[PDB]
Design a protein around this ligand. Structure first.
Ligand SMILES: *[C@H]1O[C@H](CO)[C@@H](O[C@H]2O[C@H](CO)[C@@H](O[C@H]3O[C@H](CO)[C@@H](O[C@H]4O[C@H](CO)[C@@H](O)[C@H](O)[C@H]4O)[C@H](O)[C@H]3O)[C@H](O)[C@H]2O)[C@H](O)[C@H]1O
Ligand SMILES: *[C@H]1O[C@H](CO)[C@@H](O[C@H]2O[C@H](CO)[C@@H](O[C@H]3O[C@H](CO)[C@@H](O[C@H]4O[C@H](CO)[C@@H](O)[C@H](O)[C@H]4O)[C@H](O)[C@H]3O)[C@H](O)[C@H]2O)[C@H](O)[C@H]1O
Ligand SMILES: O=c1ccn([C@@H]2O[C@H](COP(=O)(O)OP(=O)(O)O)[C@@H](O)[C@H]2O)c(=O)[nH]1
Ligand SMILES: O=c1ccn([C@@H]2O[C@H](COP(=O)(O)OP(=O)(O)O)[C@@H](O)[C@H]2O)c(=O)[nH]1
Ligand SMILES: [Mn+2]
Ligand SMILES: [Mn+2]
Lengths: 263, 263
């Protein structure tokens, strides 16, 4: 139990808000004892903000922070991710002593309140460059000092990837080489890249997954789902469908717990 | 150092021998002070063994160890990797107190003799599942005990991937959670996936690469190289041509340093 600790997510629009709602629903499903917070920006509709208030204990309105870094963003073919600097506001939440930030395209599969035993900055490795942590799940300590240091670093130097992950890795640069306890097990941030790349590892380690991360351009809410049979249509060359269990769980939670609040 | 430590590689045939020759040449180029050893099996031709003897300090003939694990191997679409259990013979080399095993599809870009400061088992994370180490570059201590333990585990339980990496990760299972000094920086084993997946990270960290690993089915020696222009032909869908400088370096060393030894 912890009144002064929270899970925190971010949505800048109504599309990612569907993700945030499924994430928050999943944290409730697995009996979290912590608070649930969502950072939301003005593009989130008034009606959607009210729906977010049913799942989250706090809906906190913040300003969009945008890197404007088209060079690095287009490099990744993710031109829309400049607005992920808005994550930095999570450090302003000094009403909490410790928080876990989770991307709105994540989904909880088991209680993960034991993340609160960790200290800032604890994160899992990124499969794309595993000496960087993935910033979709991380344990941090709100601080007006750290907040301002990060804003300043972002303003002066920007981010090596145009989003929050580059700047967070640069700021928390000791991660790869210092304090193995700050390496969250990969099962706390299992990104589908690893769901499909080294299938033997998934086969032996994947059932222990605590959090799945639907990293990449096509998000769960972009699929066509049939609730009668519980199937999605898959583009003839779609990776996420290696182990579609996770996407179907996303859609079952959305269909049962969230969609009826929206339409 | 001089006499009692070694880099060790493996080739079961004359194709991967071209890899071992380029690797060994690269280790000499960057002025290693350690011994160079290659494990070779009977499929390696007599003429190729003689060429290997011009680059390596010793060619050690060993028996092929084959998992026969079609199920796990076909699952990775690498049905030929059952013979990678032959790597386990590296622990039999008790003429050395400490060694670095390197896959025959690796290439050294800088002196990496400081690896001998590390202790068994030190290895870099695997991008496919980064709580596993990649077994293409690892620091180990030869031991008749460890050798026999590994052979026995392979005989009785096999490997989760049908190759050496699964069994090595299973045996050395503390790697992800214990002793951060046994995490080699990813620059000591910079593999394919990561050269093309998270391009911004390569752009800021890739210049520091010490070892490139041509992981995957298409090996450098399977490309068609034109020495006049210094280009390769690529199949229109080849991700590893995003940053082709490593492949061309491989071919430059092959063409300039290895080819004269094959006369
Ligand atoms: C298999 O599927 C995937 C998705 O189509 C493909 O993977 C490629 O595309 C991903 C980008 O969509 C790459 O992931 C890298 O880049 C991401 C950002 O674009 C990283 O995401 C992280 O960083 C952002 C921005 O700073 C943060 O806001 C996020 O919270 C955080 O997750 C990701 O870590 C990084 O690895 C991937 O490398 C590409 O390979 C692949 O092509 C398909 O075959
Ligand atoms: C981009 O190209 C890459 C090629 O690198 C594609 O990657 C896929 O295919 C790889 C295998 O060819 C996958 O790598 C995984 O499996 C390898 C074995 O097949 C692993 O290699 C390691 O294990 C072997 C066997 O035990 C050892 O002998 C080796 O020394 C060791 O390197 C590798 O670690 C593991 O990640 C990759 O994950 C696949 O995604 C990719 O599809 C293209 O898009
Ligand atoms: O237009 C956007 C893009 C991103 N996000 C937030 O930023 C996070 C990181 O982006 P995303 O998960 O798309 O990046 P990926 O993990 O695919 O690299 C999302 O999960 C959301 O919380 C957002 O609110 N609006
Ligand atoms: O037919 C083979 C296949 C593999 N190897 C050896 O085993 C290593 C691992 O195989 P590979 O590098 O092809 O696996 P990858 O790194 O691509 O997954 C090689 O580098 C070689 O040293 C070999 O000698 N003969
Ligand atoms: Mn994400
Ligand atoms: Mn290899």
């Amino acid at each position: 139990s912890m009144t002064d600790q929270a899970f925190v997510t971010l949505t800048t629009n109504d599309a990612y808000a569907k993700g945030a709602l499924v994430l928050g629903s999943s944290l409730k499903q697995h009996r979290t004892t912590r608070r649930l917070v969502v950072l939301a920006t003005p593009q989130v509709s008034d009606s959607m903000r009210k729906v977010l208030e049913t799942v989250f204990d706090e809906v906190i309105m913040v300003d969009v922070l945008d890197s404007g870094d088209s060079a690095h963003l287009t490099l990744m073919k993710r031109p829309e991710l400049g607005v992920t600097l808005t994550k930095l506001h999570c450090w302003s939440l000094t009403q909490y002593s410790k928080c876990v930030f989770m991307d709105a395209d994540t989904l909880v599969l088991a209680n993960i309140d034991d993340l609160f035993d960790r200290e800032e900055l604890s994160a899992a490795p990124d499969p794309g460059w595993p000496d960087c942590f993935n910033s979709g799940v991380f344990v941090y300590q709100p601080s007006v000092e750290t907040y301002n240091q990060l804003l300043h670093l972002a303003s002066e130097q920007g981010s090596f990837d145009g989003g929050d992950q580059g700047i967070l890795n640069t700021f928390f640069s000791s991660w790869a080489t210092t304090d193995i306890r700050k390496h969250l097990p990969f099962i706390y941030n299992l990104s589908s890249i690893s769901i499909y790349s080294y299938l033997p590892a998934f086969k032996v380690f994947g059932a222990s997954a605590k959090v799945v991360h639907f990293l990449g351009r096509v998000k769960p809410w972009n699929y066509t789902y049939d609730p009668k049979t519980k199937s999605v249509k898959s583009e003839a060359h779609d990776p996420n469908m290696t182990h579609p269990e996770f996407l179907i769980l996303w859609w079952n939670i959305f269909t049962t717990n969230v969609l009826p609040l929206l339409q």
